[PDB]
From Swiss-Prot:
Involved in immunity against exogenously supplied nisin. The gene is nisI. It is found in: Cell membrane. Its main location: membrane. This is Nisin immunity protein. GO terms for biological process: bacteriocin immunity. Keywords: Bacteriocin immunity, Cell membrane, Lipoprotein, Membrane, Palmitate, Signal. GO terms for cellular component: plasma membrane.
Length: 108
């Protein structure tokens, strides 16, 4: 219908009621197709599991909590583009941190 980031996961996309997650795959222009949709939001999560962090923690981490086993990731919602020889329903490309990354359907 329209690309929506999962309310529970800043690393997932809720599109057509289907669920697509982004690992880390650099998508070159030769594999990239054409422009699909434009984004304009940013989120922060702990990449270990994908736990979204609130905007109140985006600056004030913790002063004693020892985040030594918590690895935040700040992903900027970049525009979406298609992939040559692949449907959006299986896999597509998303501009993440100015780098187009491959997202693949997942069931969670």
């Amino acid at each position: 219908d329209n690309f929506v980031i999962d309310k529970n996961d800043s690393r997932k996309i809720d599109y057509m009621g289907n669920i697509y997650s982004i690992s880390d795959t650099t998508v070159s222009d030769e594999e990239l197709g054409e422009y699909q949709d434009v984004l304009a939001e940013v989120r922060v999560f702990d990449s270990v599991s994908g736990k979204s962090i609130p905007r109140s923690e985006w600056g004030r981490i913790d002063k004693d909590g020892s985040n030594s086993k918590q690895s935040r990731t700040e992903w900027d919602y970049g525009e979406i583009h298609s992939i040559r020889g692949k449907s959006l329903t299986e896999a597509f490309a998303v501009e993440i941190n100015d780098d187009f990354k491959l997202a693949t359907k997942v069931g969670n």
